[PDB]
Amino acid sequence: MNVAVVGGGISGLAVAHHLRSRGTDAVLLESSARLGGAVGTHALAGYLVEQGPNSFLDREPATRALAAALNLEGRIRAADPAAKRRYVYTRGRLRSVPASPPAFLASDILPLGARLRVAGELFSRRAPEGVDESLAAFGRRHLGHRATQVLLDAVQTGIYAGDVEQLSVAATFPMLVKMEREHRSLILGAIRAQKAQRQAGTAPKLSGALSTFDGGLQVLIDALAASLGDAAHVGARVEGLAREDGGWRLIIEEHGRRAELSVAQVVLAAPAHATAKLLRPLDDALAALVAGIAYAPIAVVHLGFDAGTLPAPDGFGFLVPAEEQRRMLGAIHASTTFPFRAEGGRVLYSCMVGGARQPGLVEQDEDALAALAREELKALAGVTARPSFTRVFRWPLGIPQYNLGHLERVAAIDAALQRLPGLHLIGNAYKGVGLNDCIRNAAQLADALVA
Numbered sequence: 498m499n500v501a502v503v504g505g506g507i508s509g510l511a512v513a514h515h516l517r518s519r520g521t522d523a524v525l526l527e528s529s530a531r532l533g534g535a536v537g538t539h540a541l542a543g544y545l546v547e548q549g550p551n552s553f554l555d556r557e558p559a560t561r562a563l564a565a566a567l568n569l570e571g572r573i574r575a576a577d578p579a580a581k582r583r584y585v586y587t588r589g590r591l592r593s594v595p596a597s598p599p600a601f602l603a604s605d606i607l608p609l610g611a612r613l614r615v616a617g618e619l620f621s622r623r624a625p626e627g628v629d630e631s632l633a634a635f636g637r638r639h640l641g642h643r644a645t646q647v648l649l650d651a652v653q654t655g656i657y658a659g660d661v662e663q664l665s666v667a668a669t670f671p672m673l674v675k676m677e678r679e680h681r682s683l684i685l686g687a688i689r690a691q692k693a694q695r696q697a698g699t700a701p702k703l704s705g706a707l708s709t710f711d712g713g714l715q716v717l718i719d720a721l722a723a724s725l726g727d728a729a730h731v732g733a734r735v736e737g738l739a740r741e742d743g744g745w746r747l748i749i750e751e752h753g754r755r756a757e758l759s760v761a762q763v764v765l766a767a768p769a770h771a772t773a774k775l776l777r778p779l780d781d782a783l784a785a786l787v788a789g790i791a792y793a794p795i796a797v798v799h800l801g802f803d804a805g806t807l808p809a810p811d812g813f814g815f816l817v818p819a820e821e822q823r824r825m826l827g828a829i830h831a832s833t834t835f836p837f838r839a840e841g842g843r844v845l846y847s848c849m850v851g852g853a854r855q856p857g858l859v860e861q862d863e864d865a866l867a868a869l870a871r872e873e874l875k876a877l878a879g880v881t882a883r884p885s886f887t888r889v890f891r892w893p894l895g896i897p898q899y900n901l902g903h904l905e906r907v908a909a910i911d912a913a914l915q916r917l918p919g920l921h922l923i924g925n926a927y928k929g930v931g932l933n934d935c936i937r938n939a940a941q942l943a944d945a946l947v948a
């Protein structure tokens with residue numbers, strides 16, 4: 498009847514919250530001095546700066562249901578005004594990526610033949626049978642070379658900060674592969690799905706807008722921490738678990754000393770590496786599978802500027818293609834996107850450095866990373882002004898990379914867990930990277946847990 502949750506990030510918090518709110522007592526244990534994991538918002542120099550994640554697309558019911566059952570729905574905030582535009586640095590300058598098919602055809606985002614090739618997606622050849630094809634392979638077949646080389650690579654780097662050649666399209670973009678399976682052409686599927694909904698309320702309708710909370714994403718975690726209370730233990734590192742008449746025994750280190758705990762079922766919300774260490778003495782082959790999940794390191798450089806030292810930049814931000822051979826991945830554009838996250842007309846840039854193709858840059862110190870960010874923002878965006886604020890967050894264990902073979906690996910992980918009753922896994926490593934995905938998967942697990 499009692500459950501233990503290892504890891505105090507969103508995956509773990511949401512699982513623990515959903516279990517309690519359905520009549521199942523849960524205990525959560527977190528290594529750090531604080532809950533949240535990657536998610537964290539800091540109040541510094543008149544700004545609200547984000548540790549990692551900045552926003553979520555307001556299109557997931559599970560994250561709405563979580564916000565409702567936590568009295569947060571009125572604190573959600575439009576990714577406000579300014580540019581709905583986004584930019585890609587390609588061929589010498591920042592270029593607006595168009596939002597509509599007619600605008601795209603007249604755009605200069607790609608050369609004429611390359612634009613016409615995207616329209617030729619209607620004649621996309623069949624997908625390779627029984628092959629877990631790469632995102633880049635998917636791109637060349639559907640979109641043409643230029644579109645995948647500049648546009649698809651941008652979307653990819655914006656979400657996973659990874660290698661477009663290594664990422665599995667089935668694991669990273671499941672709805673695109675499903676679309677492909679059903680209609681071959683994506684344009685065809687869009688035309689047909691548009692016809693389907695056109696041929697016939699009660700609660701509302703989700704906008705899909707880029708959203709956050711009024712005090713940043715910290716609002717969600719502070720609301721989770723408060724909802725769990727004494728069930729959420731901070732500075733409690735689990736460093737062992739074993740069987741015991743069904744059931745499970747956790748070895749926990751809290752206030753410098755050793756402690757033990759017996760529970761009916763265990764839920765592991767820790768990153769792949771930390772979870773593998775725990776699974777090792779239990780099943781070496783399963784631990785190997787979990788340990789095989791690659792992570793791309795990433796560092797975020799925040800650069801704040803005094804009101805009037807530079808103009809407010811247009812749009813949600815810009816991304817830079819790997820082929821441009823640059824040391825930065827892109828920037829937001831946070832003050833523009835969410836005005837309330839900056840006071841007194843100050844302008845905030847949140848630059849992203851590293852990814853799967855440049856993991857070595859994240860090892861450098863904070864002053865070197867700040868220097869890097871300024872040089873690139875000068876060469877690409879034309880920002881010459883001196884920053885009045887500078888804050889750097891490094892994640893050596895960054896974003897999990899859903900590379901080729903990932904989907905069959907998660908299947909092998911699932912099959913191995915069935916031989917170990919009462920043991921469960923969630924987290925960004927497995928079946929979704931974003932906040933929305935973690936929240937959804939967390940709720941689904943908790944529901945299925947009451948069996």
Ligand SMILES: Cc1cc2nc3c(=O)[nH]c(=O)nc-3n(C[C@H](O)[C@H](O)[C@H](O)COP(=O)(O)OP(=O)(O)OC[C@H]3O[C@@H](n4cnc5c(N)ncnc54)[C@H](O)[C@@H]3O)c2cc1C
Nearest residue numbers: 504506507508528534535549550551552735924925931932
């Ligand atoms: C730079 C960056 C930007 C991002 N931007 C976005 C974005 O804007 N939109 C979006 O949707 N997503 C974004 N994400 C992705 C998303 O934030 C993460 O994938 C997600 O928050 C991970 O949550 P998690 O709980 O699954 O893992 P984690 O947050 O890492 O939680 C795992 C926790 O377990 C703890 N732990 C480890 N070992 C033990 C132990 N043995 N005992 C107890 N506890 C342990 C760790 O301390 C950690 O806190 C971003 C990620 C990064 C890093």
Ligand SMILES: CCCCCCCCCCCC(=O)OCC[C@H](C)[C@@H]1OC[C@H](C)[C@@H]1C
Nearest residue numbers: 583654655656658814815816827828849931
């Ligand atoms: C789509 C919702 C996010 C899904 C899960 C991860 C998304 C968060 C990306 C992690 C950060 C990341 O590593 O990529 C950099 C993000 C860049 C800077 C921004 O992407 C949109 C803007 C144009 C700007 C260039």
